Design a protein around this ligand. Structure first.
Ligand SMILES: [Ca+2]
Ligand SMILES: [Ca+2]
Lengths: 758, 758
């Protein structure tokens, strides 16, 4: 671990609870481990030297800073303060700082000991007795963006019930917090606490929101301190015995952390052809993913991994299916225990028969689960969402854990859950019943009235009229006399696709649409019709875009392929043959229906009023341009060799996808292309890797290696010490997105192992 | 009428269907009369000379231009066009233009003949034979704002089904229109037509959207032409016999129009002490109101008057109660037949027992009625609104008609309808049941769910959350952890008050609010709580602001006061005694509860959690500042002399309301004051006149006369030829609002009658 110092800049001295960057994400990168609910930063100068500033608290679903300096050590001799020089750095699994002075030296090492407690070793070297002083102060200011205050609002003024208080204890001190149910900002139980326990007797003076503690030592000695963020009264009670254990045998906990991390690196850094710089990227990915891992909390009874511990809306233990599949696929190779847990977390809330909220969605996996359940399920959580799910690469992910562990009991455990999810797609996301799914949405309070009528708002100029009923919707779409049409259910469908702004789903701005029509196209070519899915008895099951997506179909091909393998592993030959048959049928549909012989590429197809003579639901939507979904059949292995050869030529074309940073979310030729548009131009690491793997699968590994090299040389900040983000401008390589982004980290790790090299 | 040429500039050559000003109103002022559904403009120069350009069609609920030049005459002799010099002007009730040449002259007079037809007299004087040519062309461009096109969209491109078509006929030509149901822009039945009939045979050639008609005359001759905009097949059939009668006795129709207008002027201009300039303003008001008068159309079976025939959202026959009361009050003095009809139109849709939509609203008068009924009543109209009503000055208006006509049958006719409306307020707009109504909203699809749960949206940052249920609402308001709360029913309540952005109703911008709090005030001081009103058996009747408005209480005083007067006139002494008692109780409440001695003014009171010891629902809301409602008790006669004396001192204070243009919608001292804010500073003619009348009622006629003079000398454009608008900046006198605004015209006329003097 010592070979990788400061892979990510973890220094910082927060002055606001919400010390955000331009996109509302915490602008510092705290160290979290063991799935804990609090993190720490490194001192950035004389003002924070002696402690690890920026205590970051994960308040159920958000990350909020508690203080800048807190338990910062200063040393005194003969009544005079010792003058230290600072050296601070992070390593995978720990924060370290060394203070050097003539007669006194201090070496502090901070590692995590339990899912709720971090351990600080303060090794003091001194030839004479000394007086120690620790100080701390809770933050007062509420919000800032890029170092500048957004307002003069204070934490206490904004949250009168927070009522933070510092109290002395028999072996340290604790901060207590009142109950705050700020749905989108701060969530506490009224029983949460931040505790500080120490190995020596200390003298504490509390002055409101600041404190000063003193202690006298006789000479060189090593003290131990535990820091714990406990979210409930039960957690507080349970942790006490652990804290006692930690202080009694601190060496065991330091060693356990050290060995655990040596193992992550040993198991994960498996590419001997990688350069030191490329290996460092892999380590950054490992640090990022492990930092985003959260232990069980609230409604989530399993360890999980979120998109970003520092993200505005991705913190706490908020978990999404899409992210989980890629996260677990990567983590299977270095932290398999958590990879498995993350998958379990998502499936733990899979809809069961007789569900109290949506019995018509058996097998469904929620878009978002978190500490707090939605009001529909008895909680007060505002994030918990069941309006949609995400593209399914669940089987792919489960199989990867097996590839590494060869644990058949893991397959036995997950198989029935994967089958239930697989079956749900076919019942609730197959409007025309041809076995090829569509992205869509569920029946929900945000999508329809009490009686089941689909809600929608028509916008024209400054007029906004809300209506309901599929019939009325049909009439409105026909006339097309509106500037825009907002359908909550269709918005949810865009979320279900994983690319809510992609051109293929009808997203194009006025400027682009005008040019399109000016070139001979019709604005109606961009209208994606919507439909409801009802059972044979008339029961509303959900909704579907009247369009079948080629990536969706390819993921379904993958699902069947892996389910067939699992069935074989479990000794279920007949089920294996069925899935093998389902896979073949999907491959044939993908190749016959979604491949356009003329443009030599794959596209989505509309579910037209009547199917084509060949049985296809509709023709490929070539007019909306080419996108990454085009190589989904290659990545998933549904493509024929000839069609793959054709797609690869387009991918390598500099006028299409072979840009400064290759394989973006829309070809340069796409009418809705935008170099800065998230899903209509920007390059995402997952789609990029899918592309290279698809290329490799059909015999083009040499070309994939070339594109990977281009990516390594052009993707901005790759070899720097900044946090991992979400995407890149394809022309400039400039980064955008939330810092410490999990799925980017996951695919960067995959790239390191599969395509990066000297 | 000849003494008033060009009172309003009616010249113009529209080049767009929507030739709008900066606020989306048609930038020209077409001549409309007899309640017809089409209007004409005067030629602006050589380009339009020979015809009356800018055919304006009232397409059910909107005003849309059809063409610039249409049926424009040019005269030819020996193949050479006769060169004419132009003279054109409008007079009350007619448009006139004269073309002068050496040996040829043409005199054209255009007046309206029926509620669907205008008549043009073309008198040609010539010493030699001549070849006549009439030409026209339909507009092509869709929209522009003050001359600058808003896009390159064409009419046909925007409305593919409009399919305008010109066809030749044996006696002229016609333009037919396809069926267009563009709710917010253009409404046609698919059977509407614009017909041109002439007294002399002409050969018409059609070329796409343009036409040319030719005829040869042997010398001086006078021809007659009729122009008719017919909106339905039935109207088309019915008008034919009218056109025949018109062409058989053209001079009789011209005379009838002339006489009708001489009568309007004789009846209306009765102030012998007015200056020529002040009289001209009265004439402009008369022309404006008569132009906004519409004959029966669609669902409205009575003649009515709209806020503005040229308004973006006030055209067609859209009618509101608030406007109607003031419109009829003024029109009683010159066009009483239509004043009565306007009142009848509003009450024709008053809710009756057993109503199919809102049986719980018997007596209720809709906020907006128009050609097309709402979908809830079987139509496809989007304007028809029953989410709320308007302040009630219905009795006051009905009484003015009686004061002029002395027709007791009129009072007998309206009395029961007024009584029903009176009773509705007490049942559905008195949340705490103390007999003092509040402004509120009805049960509506836009306000609540099918089960009757009140809808509302909570906004925090970029997060929006639509919830339902009064209990949930109460909680949200208690926590106050939001930036804004959007409640459809409360929005409708602001519409019912007639001042949707008034300070007293909680409307204040961030800057102003931050300043208020910085000065020691509480932000919650501007929070107006809301409540539902339910009957004994639990039926939802509607909603009420938890606030009793002083103007509302004063209008209820007025209602009872005038009903008592009517009961006496109708010989119902016991009913009179009851209304007198109710009026008395309201006056006592207004004087005891809403008057604040300290600031010498009246204010709304909150309906506090518990009433005050004296029985008042709450303390006057003095902290939100003073507004025009403060003198409502004076205008309506509810104030005691002592309280009136106090209020008048504040009104005449230049640091409060006695500004450049006096008596605006918010005192200069109001914390939410804004010189350009419609309801928080701007001066409206109705509130101004209410103030002068209130002043006069309590002995201050001298001061009211002075303010009237100040208004006449300071209100911008008053003596110019521009159309009447909505309001004025109190500091500069600058105008804003829809052109040809009815209620401003109504009150300007009242000012002419009551206070304007030499
Ligand atoms: Ca399908
Ligand atoms: Ca009341």
């Amino acid at each position: 671990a010592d070979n990788y110092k400061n892979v990510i800049n973890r220094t910082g001295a927060p002055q606001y609870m919400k010390d955000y960057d331009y996109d509302d994400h915490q602008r510092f990168n705290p160290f979290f481990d063991l799935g804990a609910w609090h993190g720490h930063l490194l001192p950035d100068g004389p003002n924070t030297m002696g402690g690890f500033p920026g205590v970051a608290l994960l308040t159920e679903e958000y990350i909020n800073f508690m203080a800048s300096n807190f338990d910062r050590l200063t040393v005194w001799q003969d009544g005079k303060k010792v003058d230290f020089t600072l050296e601070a750095y992070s390593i995978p699994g720990a924060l370290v700082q060394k203070l050097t002075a003539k007669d006194v030296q201090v070496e502090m090492t901070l590692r995590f000991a339990t899912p709720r407690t971090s351990l600080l070793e303060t090794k003091i070297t001194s030839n004479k007795p000394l007086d120690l002083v620790w100080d701390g102060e809770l933050l007062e200011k509420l919000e800032a963006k890029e170092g500048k205050p957004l307002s003069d609002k204070t934490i206490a003024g904004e949250y009168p019930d927070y009522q933070r208080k510092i109290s002395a204890t028999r072996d340290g001190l604790k901060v207590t917090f009142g109950k705050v149910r700020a749905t989108w900002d701060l969530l506490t139980s009224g029983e949460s606490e931040y505790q500080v326990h120490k190995s020596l007797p200390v003298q504490t003076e509390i002055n409101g929101n600041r404190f000063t503690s003193k202690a006298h030592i006789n000479g060189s000695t090593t003290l131990y301190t535990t820091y714990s963020h406990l979210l409930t009264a039960q957690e507080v009670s349970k942790e006490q015995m652990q804290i006692r254990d930690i202080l009694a045998r601190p060496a065991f906990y330091l060693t356990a952390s050290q060995q655990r991390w040596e193992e992550y690196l040993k198991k994960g850094l498996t590419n001997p052809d990688a350069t030191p710089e490329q290996t460092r990227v892999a380590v950054k990915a490992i640090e990022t993913l492990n930092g985003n891992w959260r232990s069980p909390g609230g409604a989530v009874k399993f360890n999980t991994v979120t998109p970003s511990v520092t993200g505005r809306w991705f913190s706490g233990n908020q978990t999404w299916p899409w992210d989980t599949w890629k996260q677990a696929f990567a983590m299977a190779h270095f932290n398999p225990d958590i990879a498995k847990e993350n998958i379990r977390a998502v499936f733990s809330w899979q809809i069961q028969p007789g569900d109290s909220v949506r019995p018509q969605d058996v097998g469904f996996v929620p878009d978002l689960i978190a500490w707090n359940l939605s009001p529909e399920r008895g909680g007060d959580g505002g994030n918990w969402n069941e309006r949609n799910t995400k593209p399914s690469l669940a089987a792919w992910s489960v199989m990867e854990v097996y590839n590494v562990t060869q644990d058949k009991t893991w397959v036995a455990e997950m198989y029935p859950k994967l089958v239930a999810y697989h079956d749900w797609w076919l019942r609730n996301r197959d409007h025309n019943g041809n076995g090829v799914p569509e992205y869509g949405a569920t029946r929900d309070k945000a999508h329809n009235t009490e009686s089941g009528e689909m809600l929608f708002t028509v916008k024209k100029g400054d007029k906004e009229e809300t209506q309901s009923g599929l019939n009325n919707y049909a009439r409105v779409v026909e006339k097309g006399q509106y500037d825009s049409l907002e359908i909550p259910a269709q918005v949810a469908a865009s979320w279900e696709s994983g690319r809510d702004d992609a051109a293929v789903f009808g997203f194009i701005d006025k400027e682009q649409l005008d040019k399109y029509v000016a070139n001979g196209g019709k604005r109606s070519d961009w209208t994606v019709k919507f439909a409801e899915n009802r059972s044979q008895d008339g029961t509303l099951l959900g909704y579907s875009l009247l369009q079948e997506s080629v990536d969706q179909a390819s993921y379904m091909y993958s699902d069947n392929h892996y389910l067939a393998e699992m069935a074989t592993i479990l000794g279920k030959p007949e089920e294996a043959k069925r899935y093998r048959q389902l896979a073949q049928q999907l491959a044939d549909y993908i190749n016959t229906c979604m491949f356009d012989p003329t443009t030599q590429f794959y596209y989505d197809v509309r579910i037209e009023d009547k199917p084509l003579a060949n049985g296809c639901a509709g023709k490929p939507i070539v007019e909306r341009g080419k996108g990454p979904e085009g190589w989904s059949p290659l990545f998933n292995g549904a493509a024929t060799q000839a069609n793959a050869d054709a797609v690869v030529k387009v991918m390598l074309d500099p006028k299409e996808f072979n840009t400064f940073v290759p394989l973006g979310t829309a070809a340069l030729t796409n009418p809705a292309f935008g170099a800065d548009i998230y899903w209509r131009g920007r390059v995402w690491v997952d789609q990029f890797w899918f592309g290279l793997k698809g290329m490799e699968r059909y015999g083009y590994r040499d070309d994939a290696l070339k594109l990977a090299d281009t990516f390594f040389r052009h993707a901005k900040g790759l070899t720097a010490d900044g946090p991992i983000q979400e995407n890149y401008n394809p022309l400039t390589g400039a980064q955008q997105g939330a810092p410490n982004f999990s799925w980017s980290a996951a695919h960067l790790y995959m790239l390191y192992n599969d395509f990066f090299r000297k």
